Amino acid sequence: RIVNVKLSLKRYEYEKPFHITGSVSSESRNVEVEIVLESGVKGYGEASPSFRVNGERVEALLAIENAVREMITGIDVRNYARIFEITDRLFGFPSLKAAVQFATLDALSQELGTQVCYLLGGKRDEIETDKTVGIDTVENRVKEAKKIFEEGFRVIKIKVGENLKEDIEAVEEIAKVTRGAKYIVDANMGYTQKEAVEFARAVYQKGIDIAVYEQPVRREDIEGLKFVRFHSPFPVAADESARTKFDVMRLVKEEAVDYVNIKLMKSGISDALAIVEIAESSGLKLMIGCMGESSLGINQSVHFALGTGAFEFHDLDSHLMLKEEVFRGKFIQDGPRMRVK
Amino acid sequence: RIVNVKLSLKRYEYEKPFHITGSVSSESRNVEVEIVLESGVKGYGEASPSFRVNGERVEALLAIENAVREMITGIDVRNYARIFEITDRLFGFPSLKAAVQFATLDALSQELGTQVCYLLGGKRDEIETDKTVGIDTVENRVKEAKKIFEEGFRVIKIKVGENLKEDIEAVEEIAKVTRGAKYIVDANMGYTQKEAVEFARAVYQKGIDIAVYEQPVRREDIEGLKFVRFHSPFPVAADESARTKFDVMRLVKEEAVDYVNIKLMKSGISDALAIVEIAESSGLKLMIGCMGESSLGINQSVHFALGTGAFEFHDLDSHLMLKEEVFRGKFIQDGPRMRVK
Ligand SMILES: [Mg+2]
Numbered sequence: 303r304i305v306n307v308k309l310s311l312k313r314y315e316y317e318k319p320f321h322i323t324g325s326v327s328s329e330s331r332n333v334e335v336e337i338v339l340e341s342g343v344k345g346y347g348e349a350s351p352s353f354r355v356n357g358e359r360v361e362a363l364l365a366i367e368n369a370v371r372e373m374i375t376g377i378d379v380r381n382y383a384r385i386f387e388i389t390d391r392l393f394g395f396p397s398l399k400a401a402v403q404f405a406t407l408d409a410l411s412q413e414l415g416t417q418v419c420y421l422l423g424g425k426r427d428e429i430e431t432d433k434t435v436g437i438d439t440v441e442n443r444v445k446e447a448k449k450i451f452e453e454g455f456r457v458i459k460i461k462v463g464e465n466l467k468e469d470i471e472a473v474e475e476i477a478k479v480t481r482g483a484k485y486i487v488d489a490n491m492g493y494t495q496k497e498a499v500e501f502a503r504a505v506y507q508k509g510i511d512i513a514v515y516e517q518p519v520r521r522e523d524i525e526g527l528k529f530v531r532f533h534s535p536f537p538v539a540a541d542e543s544a545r546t547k548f549d550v551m552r553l554v555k556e557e558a559v560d561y562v563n564i565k566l567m568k569s570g571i572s573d574a575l576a577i578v579e580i581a582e583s584s585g586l587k588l589m590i591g592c593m594g595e596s597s598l599g600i601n602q603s604v605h606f607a608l609g610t611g612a613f614e615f616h617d618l619d620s621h622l623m624l625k626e627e628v629f630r631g632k633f634i635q636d637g638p639r640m641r642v643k
Numbered sequence: 644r645i646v647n648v649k650l651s652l653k654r655y656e657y658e659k660p661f662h663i664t665g666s667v668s669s670e671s672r673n674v675e676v677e678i679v680l681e682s683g684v685k686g687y688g689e690a691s692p693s694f695r696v697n698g699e700r701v702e703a704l705l706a707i708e709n710a711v712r713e714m715i716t717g718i719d720v721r722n723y724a725r726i727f728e729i730t731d732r733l734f735g736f737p738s739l740k741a742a743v744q745f746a747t748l749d750a751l752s753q754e755l756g757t758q759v760c761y762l763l764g765g766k767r768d769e770i771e772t773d774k775t776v777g778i779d780t781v782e783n784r785v786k787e788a789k790k791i792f793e794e795g796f797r798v799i800k801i802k803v804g805e806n807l808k809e810d811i812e813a814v815e816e817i818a819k820v821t822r823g824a825k826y827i828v829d830a831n832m833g834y835t836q837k838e839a840v841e842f843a844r845a846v847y848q849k850g851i852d853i854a855v856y857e858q859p860v861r862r863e864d865i866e867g868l869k870f871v872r873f874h875s876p877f878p879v880a881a882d883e884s885a886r887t888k889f890d891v892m893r894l895v896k897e898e899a900v901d902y903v904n905i906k907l908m909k910s911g912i913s914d915a916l917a918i919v920e921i922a923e924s925s926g927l928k929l930m931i932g933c934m935g936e937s938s939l940g941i942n943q944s945v946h947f948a949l950g951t952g953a954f955e956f957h958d959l960d961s962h963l964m965l966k967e968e969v970f971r972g973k974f975i976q977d978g979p980r981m982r983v984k
């Protein structure tokens with residue numbers, strides 16, 4: 303049984319300001335969650351809130367600690383589905399819902415003498431993550447891409463969305479100096495339907511291939527996502543448009559996207575498991591991403607990816623661009639690779 | 644890791660012939676599955692094949708024992724997702740796929756020191772099953788219904804499909820002597836779309852309410868299922884039309900049914916989990932059924948039901964119609980109630 307639930311503010315500074323369409327941050331403010339069982343076992347999770355995507359504010363998450371304690375204290379973690387149903391009511395605090403649910407499995411796995419990934423199926427022993435190139439001058443972008451490549455990463459994520467002409471130029475220049483790497487382009491809702499299509503065609507015409515083209519249009523523009531999917535050569539993904547399992551069922555029914563970028567910070571463990579199943583029962587493919595998690599937080603996604611083995615691509619690099627005193631994940635980080643202990 | 648797998652034929656005779664639309668059985672010939680782990684732990688499962696529903700034949704199942712052994716031995720049950728993916732290739736032997744996948748969870752849970760229901764969420768501690776009234780003269784049906792009612796069952800499943808007029812009379816007569824009970828009507832594909840509608844309207848006009856109206860039309864008639872749903876007052880369920888997670892995605896997309904009767908013998912654990920997630924992500928509701936499982940076989944569905952807690956109704960009574968010396972389920976059977984140990 304759970305006897306205590308602790309929420310605490312943890313700040314992590316980025317080695318350099320991270321710039322994406324309509325957003326710039328140089329710090330990551332998360333909420334660490336610790337669940338304590340009567341047996342003494344302690345499970346840990348981390349919420350990396352997003353005002354832009356989930357409408358959350360870190361001050362608001364911290365303010366509801368007492369409410370969270372009242373919601374699940376006294377419940378046995380072996381009845382984790384009950385804890386999941388209850389925490390699903392925190393749909394307005396997605397990142398916290400995610401942290402609490404993972405900390406629950408973390409505690410439960412310890413009690414069963416195993417790990418979260420195995421509890422989830424233990425499908426894979428290793429996964430590889432890409433690394434992101436934020437928005438900057440074409441020169442700086444090429445410089446960072448070149449450095450990431452030298453670091454061993456074979457999948458480079460490129461942010462775009464604020465300047466179509468320069469975005470195209472940037473992607474073309476990056477491709478030159480990183481031959482052999484796969485590319486994921488993320489526009490974070492910055493383009494109109496037509497611009498998005500133009501972007502993809504321009505790049506395509508230069509012989510460049512994009513493995514995944516992330517959320518090119520606004521979140522409510524489901525038809526726009528479909529339009530881009532049906533009128534451009536690269537696989538299109540929903541990110542901001544895919545937060546819950548209901549959003550995904552709708553995206554599938556509408557045949558709007560080739561991919562859904564799952565993020566525990568958007569869906570929590572409960573909806574993420576539903577999305578995995580929905581994708582495996584349809585033509586949908588998945589990738590897993592992150593917000594601003596530290597190593598403790600990314601640990602949640604690593605165990606989820608390793609356990610379900612449901613992703614074609616993994617974008618779990620937020621902890622790689624953060625100055626963090628010490629590693630706190632329950633996994634092994636070896637360059638672009640992440641493995642089970 | 645699994646060091647061996649054994650398949651064994653096991654027969655159970657019914658107290659009386661069980662008559663459903665286009666089928667009469669006097670015995671249940673199942674295949675018991677035993678998995679042996681290097682640790683010495685042994686997991687058990689039971690396959691109750693269906694020629695009519697799955698196209699399976701008990702002799703064919705026993706014939707591929709060596710193939711199954713070669714498929715899973717050498718795999719650690721903690722990597723059960725790998726076992727699930729491999730056994731998914733046995734789509735032509737669904738009942739066997741189910742037995743093996745459950746035996747896997749049965750072995751894993753023992754190793755972890757818990758039960759299968761908790762592994763799946765531990766959502767509920769108790770569930771209630773209905774009891775079925777097979778096709779017979781109206782007189783015998785009424786007699787059996789009253790007996791089932793006196794035994795404490797409050798959800799009575801009634802088989803119909805071969806004689807519309809008599810079927811209506813049978814339900815009307817059963818309702819009169821079982822005031823307080825809910826009814827599930829199963830036509831096992833015996834009616835045309837229009838007869839299915841007329842059956843429901845007639846029962847409705849007499850003031851009788853049907854909780855679930857199971858598979859009124861032929862299995863390939865998806866539009867027929869939808870037609871009955873949109874033109875009849877009771878919730879319509881797909882059984883024979885819903886075998887895989889892909890069948891269910893299609894049923895949802897087409898809004899063909901209100902319910903899906905999940906059977907491990909049709910879907911196995913893997914697809915059943917996917918179906919539960921699809922239902923919770925949509926307007927679909929679920930019930931869980933059985934084929935001809937003995938107590939060891941029903942145990943599989945009891946743990947799935949208790950753990951996920953995803954079902955509105957439970958039709959797990961096949962073991963109550965069989966003659967069996969020793970109870971072999973890992974659950975407590977108290978009248979219509981089934982509880983975790
Ligand atoms: Mg994204």
Ligand SMILES: [Mg+2]
Pocket residue numbers: 829831857858882904932
């Ligand atoms: Mg049925």
